[PDB]
Structure formats: structure tokens, C-alpha cells
Design a protein around this ligand. Structure first.
Ligand SMILES: Nc1ncnc2c1ncn2[C@@H]1O[C@H](COP(=O)(O)OP(=O)(O)OP(=O)(O)O)[C@@H](O)[C@H]1O
Length: 961
């Protein structure tokens, strides 16, 4: 028998034969389910604990208690009473942490340096043993939750989520507000005489029980050592024998069925949401009835429901399938975005959905379809990409609550039994008398009478008239809806090609022509049957002016539009592609199983070189683009700041306004004329990386090359004759502010940029070590202590061979206040670096070292790494070893000089730019315990981006390695 704290050990966890990680399952005596993962190669260790309790178990009068419970646990325990002991420890050992509260789950996860798993896991363990719940930390963290709510309060996705809850059964726990805010965690409690500190203590002591807990730990140590460690730390978690909450009666009764919801969005979008309440299908995980139906109703491709709706000019995109609810209840949704025509024919669109559903009922479940999904799921599991520890443990900890230890890995991938009975059972629920429909359009603006209390959402609620219902009930069968045919893109050749004699550890330049520059690497470490095919097409006509930019974007959107129907089989079969316009031409990437890449790439390049535009498509795609450009105003204020800075700092950059102004000049004949120009002269720089040979890479390149030459008559464009844009050089001691208004959000967005110098090994690590040092104290000071907002980011910015320190904050406080507090933080940090020990400094060096050396676990990750060196034309493939080596030579003084030279308010080489994106009603003027803010100069206010650039020098381009 095993250790007295372990009920049983599952030594045979089902994994992929490809997976070298060793697994072991445990069920501790206190009811904790545990999965241990041993990876002797891993650079970062990780652990996650998932409590099977969430927002649905919140007290009636206190919405968002479990979410707020999550927040507090980071801030002090009995063994470790320091407010930021946990995060500070992790930061100083190359780690990070995070947590989310769902309806039924509170998931706590972290990663850390593999040399320090025990110490990190100890501090983590104490969260579930002896939480402190400090009153000083409570009255501050309330702001962070309120700011978290105020960030998502203008988000369309979050408004619709709560609106669905608030329109169900009010008595049902589903209707409860999960996030929480200042009003529910501090305000209203201080009126009824409720003690939230005792309620947080109440919730933890009632619900945080070891019988409702699951853990996953990944480390370098052996399975036996990981066993002893988890036992030693988590065996003494108090079992409170809490019954697992269950919600068997559906929150959506017949009084909530056959209802229509007119909703006013924040962005100018048009969306249709069709919802069917279904029973909890979780028990049927190894047959997946709902996902068989989701695969067919959500299918894109010939004969599919979308294809038809798209061809009628009503709908562009379609999401279909099972949506989770909580133990006891689920949903089946069909979501589509609408065209202008679609909005008028909402009723007609829903009729078409029921015609497809009725076809499924008539046709009956198809063994071969389920068998197709079975095969691809099984390929998807076997050849699955090795995961990042932090996300892997988090996911597993959640899955442990649902499946047997031995089957926690295979569960949602491997299907077992075809069950036609279960499919028909669910399909029977997809009926007009069972629908809930939601139209989301700015057309309803000002004509609503109901308001959702938590978000302020403006909506109308009415019943669907029985005559409309009957029309949907009496829907016949359409000849234009037809079942999908055999997926010919299903991969069958998984042979890993022998590593060639010439093989290199970095991408090698195997082709150097005027037409094409070809970088290639055969994979020497992942040995999965996959390849990444990356192509950058250089044409000067793609970004010459806003109009041609618009035409380049539109060409590729219409191209993907006409390929989607064909390319969807491939996406299902693990073969994906990406096609988008750049500031230098076009970007094409094909990733996935190598087998049938040539066929897909062949058709894409063929369609590129012989593209014939459909008129109706053009008008629809153009309208969607015009509307898309207008919708950027409704984006987050911090996203606005980042965007405008990117424009400010580049020699040539067409603004959002400039593009939409020039879009009405785009016509079909003009777009038709444009394509032959784009393709007439091209240079291609490519990276082909993975399970392919030298011969195979060159054969791929020739096919793209010769297809363009044979169809589009492409002539080589010399690289030396390709003009590249440079970054704006800020003057020494200068401070510039660009001021824009966001007219939707009641929060402001700020980006403060301190430009340093051109990227080089030295300057790169100066910035990166400084950033590492200030990383957690920025979060602890500006957010945790000062409570400036939920979004407080600090790190290195890299663009156009240039770099610098950036701060990104979203806040209800004005930008000028944010500015002062960031500057106060920089003062505090300099003294911190001055005062800190020589061994605390070496921790930061060692911490950043591990982060930079942290090896890619999968092909695409190593590919994107190499692609970055190609894009920037720096070709520094051994960057990490060189830069870490230099980092270790750095002393406190090096960083002190760097700060004094480049970053201090008095710095002789401070290069400061700031983007201030104003809140809706907020002001428009540049102009107590807290640590003191220094005096700041008067900024130069940028009114014209173009003028601003014209008056400044530009940087050189970075030398190739
Ligand atoms: N939604 C997505 N679709 C397609 N590819 C994605 C998507 N998300 C991530 N990727 C790819 O996977 C990579 C992300 O890898 P991730 O950061 O999880 O691990 P990693 O890069 O190996 O990190 P490390 O090297 O530190 O271990 C990206 O480089 C990107 O190419």
C-alpha cells in the first residue's frame, strides 16, 4: 500500500506515444485529485489548483464574492504575511501567476523557474490553508475588482453574457452577477451592516474544501518526488465534505422560451444569436452528441448552412454548437453576423437554420461523419503540440473534476462509441418552440425600455408571435442544404523525414535570387509531422497610399472569402493558413500537417494569380470594411494609445481616418485593375520550417514562384530596390504628447514611451533587465497600492530596429495624473536599484536569463521566433545565448548609468513621447502617503502626425547579423 495520505495511485495515465513527459495520477485521502507531470527537460515548472466552486455559489445579497475571494488569496497568508510575497517571489524566479473565476470554477495557476518549484508551490499552498484577508488589502483590492468590471462594462461580449443571465429565471443562480463591483463588495454591505471580511472568511470556510479541489503539478523532479511534495503540502487541506453544487432545473423555462431580444451594441455591429436550452451532455463526453451537431450546423463549405446564407447576401460568418452552462444545464447556439440585407431578413435567416435542422432530422445521424470527427480528433491528440506548462496545468486541474485519472488527457479528444440515440435526443431540442433569439444592432438605439442593471445594457424584450413560430415549425427541406462530402484534406502520411546530412540548427539561406530569398530549417527537436510555410511578398504598390492600402486589404479579404468554402475542410483536418496585407506587400502562412500543404498552397497561389471578383461579394466585403474602420472608435482606450504611438513613430503610416476617407474611391473596376499591378513585380522572402527536406522546401518555393510567373506574369523585384520605412528619432530631453479622444468609454488610455536607442545586444539587455526589476513593483505600486486601474503594464517596446521603455494604463483618472505617478514610480525604482542587495540583483539577472533561454515547446513557436528575425531583417538566430551571456556581465552601476543617461527626468538623453486617449466626458487640457512626483516640463503637443514626423530625423536600419 501507498502513503497513508493517498487513497489510490493511477500509474497508467493515457497519453500520446509522442509525449515524452511522464505522468502519474493521485486521489489524496482528503479528496484532492492530482496529476503529476515529470519533464526533465523543462525550463519552467508549473502548478494549478482548481476549486469546483464559482460565481453561482455567491450569496444572494453579495454578487461577486467568489471572484473577490480569488483576488484576496494573492495578498497574504499566515506563513507568508507579505501582501506581494507570492508574486514578488515568482517574478524574481522567472515566474508569473494568474487566476480566473467562472460560474463553477476558481482556477489558480502559476509557472516558475524549475530550480524553485518547492518554494513557489509552498507559498501557493498556503492560499488554501491559512488565508489572511487583511482589511487594509480588502479596501484597496475592491477598486481593482470595480476597475475590472468598469473595463468590461463597455465590452459587447460581456454585456451580452450578463443580459442572457438577467433574462433567464431570476430565482435561478444563473442570473447572479459573477464579477462583482464596488457597490456589492463595499457599498451595499455598509448599509445592511454586513461584514464582507467575515463573509469572505465565511465563503472560504464553507466552500474551499479539499473534496472539491484538483491539482496539476509539472516539474523536472521524478514522479515519486512530485508525489512526496504534493502530499507534504496539500494533504493537510481541510476536507469540509461539501456536496458538489448542481443545477438540474434549467434557468430557461417555457416563460423564457420563444422570446425575442433587441439589443443595442457599443460598436456598430449586426449580430444574430439563436439559443436552444439543452440538458447537460457532460456525461456523454466519449460520444459527443452536441459536437456532432455543432460540426454539421456550424459547418462551412459546399452545401453548408453558412454557404447558403452567405450566397443570399444575408450573413458573413457562422458559429454553431454546444455552449456550456453549469452542471445540470447547457446551451446550443447558432450565431451569425448580419449584412445590411440580413438585418431585414432576420426572420428569413432563422427559417433557413430550421430547414437545415429539419434536414438533419430527415437524413438521420451519419456514422461516417462521426467517424470522420473521431479520426481527426485522434490525429489531433497523437500529434498535439507540446504545451506551455502554465496553461497545461491550469487546463488539467479543471479537467480532473470531470474524468477518470487515467483518461484526463484523452477525454475531450478521443471518442469511443457512436450513439445515434443521443444525437437525436439533442436534435429534438432544436425547435422553434424552444428558441431564444437576439438581434444586436445600433438600429434599436433610443427605442428600448429595459435596462440591465450591472452593465447598463439597453434592450427590448418581446415574445415571438405564434404565426412566426408556426412558419419555423412548418419549414420544409431545402435542396441547397447538402451534407458535407468526404474530407479529402485528412492527413494520412505522418512519416518523419530523416534528418538530412547538411541540416543546420538555425534557418539557412538556401535560395538567394532576385525573385525569391528562401530560409529553411528541417526540424531537429519536435519530430511531429508538421511544417510552417511563411511567405512575405514585397510589392511597393501595396502601401503606396491609403487607397492602395485599402485595395490590398480588400483583395485578400475577397480572396479568403472565396477560398473559405474550400479551405474549411483543411482547417478541420489540422491544416491552417493566414493571408494578410502588410506595409510592404502581402503575408501568407500555411501551418499544420505537412502532408497536404502543397495542395492547399497550390490552390491559394493559383487563386491569387487568377482572381476573378464577384460583384455582390465586393459590395458586402467593402461595407464590412467601412463599418470595421468606424468600429475602431469603440475599442479600449489603452488599445487606442498603442495604435496611435505605432503610427507616430513610423516614417510612413496611414491612419484609420485616412483609410476610410479613401475607401469610397475604391470601385470594382479600379480594384480589378489594381491586382495585376500588385502581382506584376514581386520579391518573396520565405521561411519553410519543420518536417521537410531541402528538396521539398525548394519544390514548394518553385511552385509559388512559377504559379505567379505562369498566371500573373510576375517579374522579379530586386531587394536592393525595395524601400524600407524607418523609426522617428526623438530629440534629447524632448517630451511630446499626442492627445486623442475616445468617445465611448468613461476611461482614459495612456501610453508613455521612453525611447532609448537602436536595438543592439548591449542596449537590449539594459532595457530588459531594468524592465524585469520594475515589472512586479509596477503592478504592486501602481495597481495594488495606488489602485490606478485594472490595466497597468510596463515593458520593452520594439519597432523598426528601435526600442524603449513603455507604460500602458487604463484609468478613470486623467492622463496627467497617471503621468505624474509613473514618474514618481521611476524615482522610487532608481533608489530601489541603488538600495537593493547584490544578491537580489543577481536573482533578477537569473530570472530574466531563464525567461529568455526558455526553449520553444512546439514548431510554430520556434518558427515565429525565426520569422521575427526575418521580418526585422536582423537574422539573429542565436540571439538568446548572446544576449543572456551579456546580461550576466551587468552590474547595478550599469543599470544606474543607463537610468541616468536615458530614463531619469533630468536625463541628458531622455526621449519621451506620450499618447493620451481621453475618456468620453473627460477634460482636454495638457497642463498624502503617496511617494512624491517630481516637477515635469511642458510637453510639445502634436496636432499633426505628419508635420511632427517631417520635423524630426529618422533612425538608420539595424545591421544584419
Ligand atoms: N490562436 C492561434 N492560432 C495559431 N497559432 C497560434 C495561436 N496562438 C499561438 N499560436 C502560435 O503558438 C506560439 C505561442 O506559443 P507559446 O507562447 O504558448 O509557447 P512558446 O512560444 O513555446 O513559449 P516559450 O518559447 O517561452 O516556451 C506563437 O508563436 C504562435 O505562432
Amino acid at each position: 500500500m501507498n502513503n497513508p495520505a493517498i487513497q489510490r495511485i493511477e500509474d497508467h495515465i493515457v497519453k500520446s506515444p509522442e509525449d515524452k513527459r511522464e505522468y502519474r495520477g493521485l486521489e489524496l485521502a482528503n479528496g484532492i485529485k492530482v496529476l503529476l507531470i515529470s519533464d526533465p527537460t523543462t525550463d519552467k515548472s508549473s502548478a494549478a489548483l482548481d476549486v469546483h466552486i464559482g460565481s453561482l455559489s455567491d450569496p444572494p445579497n453579495i454578487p461577486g464574492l467568489s471572484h473577490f475571494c480569488e483576488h484576496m488569496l494573492f495578498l497574504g497568508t499566515k506563513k507568508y504575511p507579505k501582501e506581494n510575497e507570492y508574486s514578488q517571489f515568482l517574478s524574481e524566479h522567472a515566474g508569473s501567476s494568474n487566476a480566473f473565476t467562472s460560474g463553477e470554477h476558481t482556477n489558480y495557476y502559476f509557472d516558475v523557474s524549475h530550480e524553485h518549484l518547492e518554494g513557489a508551490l509552498d507559498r501557493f499552498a498556503q492560499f488554501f490553508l491559512c488565508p489572511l484577508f487583511d482589511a487594509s488589502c480588502k479596501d484597496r483590492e475592491v477598486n481593482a475588482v470595480d476597475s475590472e468590471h468598469e473595463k468590461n462594462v463597455m465590452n459587447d461580449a460581456w454585456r451580452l453574457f450578463q443580459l442572457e443571465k438577467a433574462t433567464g429565471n431570476p430565482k435561478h443562480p444563473f442570473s447572479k452577477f459573477g464579477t462583482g463591483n464596488k457597490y456589492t463588495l463595499e457599498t451595499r454591505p455598509n448599509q445592511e451592516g454586513i461584514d464582507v471580511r467575515e463573509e469572505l472568511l465565511k465563503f472560504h470556510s464553507t466552500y474551499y474544501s479539499s473534496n472539491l479541489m484538483a491539482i496539476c503539478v509539472l516539474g523536472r523532479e521524478s514522479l515519486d518526488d512530485l508525489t512526496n511534495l504534493v502530499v507534504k503540502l496539500f494533504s493537510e487541506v481541510e476536507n469540509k465534505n461539501v456536496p458538489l453544487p448542481e443545477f438540474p432545473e434549467h434557468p430557461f423555462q417555457e416563460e423564457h422560451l420563444k422570446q425575442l431580444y433587441k439589443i443595442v451594441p457599443i460598436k456598430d455591429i449586426r449580430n444574430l444569436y439563436v439559443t436552444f436550452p439543452i440538458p447537460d451532455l457532460q456525461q456523454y463526453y466519449k460520444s459527443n452528441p452536441g459536437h456532432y451537431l455543432g460540426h454539421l450546423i456550424g459547418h462551412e463549405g459546399p452545401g453548408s448552412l453558412l454557404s447558403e446564407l452567405k450566397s443570399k447576401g444575408w450573413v458573413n460568418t457562422l458559429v454553431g454548437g454546444q455552449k456550456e452552462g453549469a452542471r445540470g444545464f447547457m446551451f446550443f447556439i447558432i450565431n451569425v453576423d448580419l449584412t445590411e440585407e440580413g438585418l431585414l431578413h432576420v426572420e428569413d435567416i432563422i427559417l433557413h437554420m430550421f430547414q437545415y435542422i429539419q434536414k438533419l432530422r430527415a437524413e438521420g445521424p451519419q456514422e461516417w461523419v462521426f467517424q470522420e470527427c473521431k479520426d481527426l480528433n485522434a490525429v489531433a491528440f497523437r500529434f498535439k503540440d507540446k504545451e506551455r506548462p502554465r496553461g497545461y496545468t491550469s487546463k488539467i486541474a479543471g479537467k480532473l473534476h470531470y474524468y477518470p485519472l487515467n483518461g484526463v488527457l484523452t477525454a475531450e479528444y478521443l471518442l469511443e462509441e457512436f450513439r445515434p440515440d443521443l444525437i437525436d435526443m439533442v436534435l429534438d431540442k432544436l425547435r422553434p418552440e424552444n428558441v431564444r433569439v437576439a438581434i444586436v444592432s445600433k438600429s434599436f438605439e433610443g427605442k428600448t425600455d429595459r435596462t440591465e442593471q450591472w452593465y447598463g445594457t439597453q434592450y427590448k424584450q418581446e415574445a415571438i408571435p405564434e404565426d412566426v413560430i408556426q412558419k419555423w415549425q412548418n419549414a420544409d427541406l431545402n435542396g441547397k442544404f447538402k451534407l458535407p462530402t468526404k474530407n479529402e484534406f485528412i492527413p494520412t502520411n505522418f512519416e518523419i523525414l530523416a534528418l538530412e546530412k547538411d541540416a543546420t540548427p538555425y534557418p539557412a539561406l538556401i535560395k538567394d535570387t532576385a525573385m525569391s530569398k528562401l530560409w529553411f530549417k528541417q526540424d531537429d527537436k519536435f519530430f511531429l509531422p508538421k511544417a510552417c510555410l511563411n511567405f512575405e511578398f514585397f510589392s511597393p504598390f501595396a502601401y503606396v497610399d491609403p487607397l492602395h492600402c485599402n485595395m490590398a486589404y480588400l483583395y485578400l479579404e475577397l480572396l479568403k472569402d472565396s477560398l473559405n468554402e474550400y479551405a474549411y475542410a483543411a482547417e478541420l483536418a489540422g491544416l491552417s493558413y493566414d493571408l494578410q496585407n502588410t506595409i510592404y506587400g502581402m503575408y501568407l502562412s500555411v501551418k499544420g500537417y505537412n502532408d497536404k500543404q502543397p495542395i492547399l498552397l497550390k490552390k491559394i497561389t493559383e487563386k491569387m494569380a487568377t482572381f476573378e471578383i464577384d460583384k455582390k461579394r465586393f459590395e458586402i466585403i467593402k461595407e464590412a470594411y467601412m463599418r470595421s474602420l468606424n468600429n475602431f472608435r469603440a475599442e479600449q482606450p489603452h488599445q487606442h494609445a498603442m495604435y496611435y504611438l505605432r503610427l507616430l513613430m513610423t516614417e510612413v503610416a496611414w491612419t484609420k481616418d485616412e483609410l476610410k476617407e479613401a475607401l469610397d474611391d475604391v470601385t470594382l473596376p479600379r480594384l480589378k485593375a489594381f491586382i495585376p499591378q500588385l502581382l506584376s513585380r514581386l520579391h518573396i522572402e520565405a521561411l519553410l520550417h519543420g518536417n521537410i527536406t531541402k528538396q521539398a522546401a525548394l519544390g514548394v518555393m518553385q511552385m509559388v514562384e512559377d504559379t505567379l510567373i505562369e498566371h500573373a506574369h510576375t517579374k522579379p523585384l530586386l531587394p536592393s530596390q525595395l524601400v524600407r520605412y524607418r523609426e522617428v528619432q526623438l530629440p534629447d530631453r524632448g517630451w511630446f504628447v499626442y492627445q486623442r479622444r475616445n468617445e465611448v468609454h468613461n476611461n482614459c488610455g495612456i501610453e508613455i514611451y521612453y525611447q532609448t536607442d537602436m536595438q543592439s545586444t548591449s542596449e537590449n539587455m539594459f532595457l530588459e533587465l531594468f524592465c524585469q526589476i520594475i515589472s512586479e513593483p509596477c503592478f504592486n505600486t501602481l495597481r495594488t497600492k495606488e489602485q490606478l486601474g485594472y490595466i497597468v503594464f510596463s515593458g520593452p517596446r520594439r519597432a523598426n530596429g528601435i526600442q524603449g521603455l513603455r507604460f500602458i494604463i487604463q484609468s478613470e483618472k486623467p492622463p496627467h495624473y497617471l503621468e505624474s505617478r509613473v514618474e514618481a514610480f521611476l524615482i522610487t525604482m532608481e533608489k530601489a536599484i541603488e538600495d537593493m542587495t547584490e544578491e537580489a540583483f543577481q536573482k533578477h539577472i537569473q530570472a530574466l536569463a531563464i525567461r529568455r533561454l526558455d526553449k520553444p515547446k512546439k514548431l510554430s513557436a520556434e518558427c515565429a521566433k525565426y520569422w521575427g528575425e526575418i521580418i526585422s531583417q536582423q537574422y539573429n538566430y542565436d540571439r538568446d545565448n548572446i544576449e543572456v551571456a551579456y546580461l550576466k556581465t551587468l552590474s547595478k552601476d550599469d543599470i544606474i548609468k543607463f537610468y541616468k543617461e536615458m530614463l531619469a527626468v533630468d536625463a541628458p538623453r531622455r526621449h519621451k513621447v506620450s499618447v493620451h486617449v481621453l475618456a468620453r466626458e473627460m477634460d482636454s487640457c495638457p497642463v498624502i502617503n503617496l511617494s512624491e512626483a517630481p516637477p515635469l516640463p511642458q510637453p510639445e503637443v502634436i496636432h499633426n502626425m505628419t508635420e511632427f514626423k517631417r520635423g524630426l530625423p529618422l533612425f538608420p536600419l539595424v545591421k544584419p547579423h
